Amino acid sequence: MAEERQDALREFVAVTGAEEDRARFFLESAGWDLQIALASFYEDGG
């Protein structure tokens, strides 16, 4: 359960390729969601 944050964001780290922690940073900031968190990585700076 609570461990989902680590694995869940990693799924993202797989999508955004971020770092367990980098994603967790904006992974959670956006609700550890992949749709939004992703738009950030891409819209993070051209």
Describe the secondary structure blueprint for this structure.
Blueprint: H1 4-15, H2 20-29, H3 35-43
Family: Belongs to the NSFL1C family.
Subcellular location: Nucleus; Golgi apparatus, Golgi stack; Chromosome; Cytoplasm, Cytoskeleton, Microtubule organizing center, Centrosome
Organism: Rattus norvegicus
Question: Could you walk me through the main structural features you see in this protein, from its secondary elements to its overall organization?
Answer:
- This is NSFL1 cofactor p47.
- It comes from Rattus norvegicus.
- Belongs to the NSFL1C family.
- With 46 residues, the chain is mainly α.
- The protein has one domain (1-46): Helicase, Ruva Protein, domain 3, CATH 1.10.8.10.
- The protein has three helices and no strands.
- It has helices at 4-15, 20-29, 35-43.
- The radius of gyration is 10 Å and the shape is elongated.
- The N and C termini lie far apart (35 Å).
Distance between the termini: 35 Å
What is the helix fraction of residues, given as a range?
55-70%
Can you tell me the number of structural domains?
1
* Top-tier CATH class: Mainly Alpha
- Could you give the count of β-strands? 0
What would you say the CATH architecture is? Orthogonal Bundle
> What is the element string, with H for helices and E for strands?
HHH
Shape, please? elongated
Describe the structure concisely for a colleague.
This protein is mostly helical. Helix content is 67%, strand content 0%. The chain has three helices and no strands.
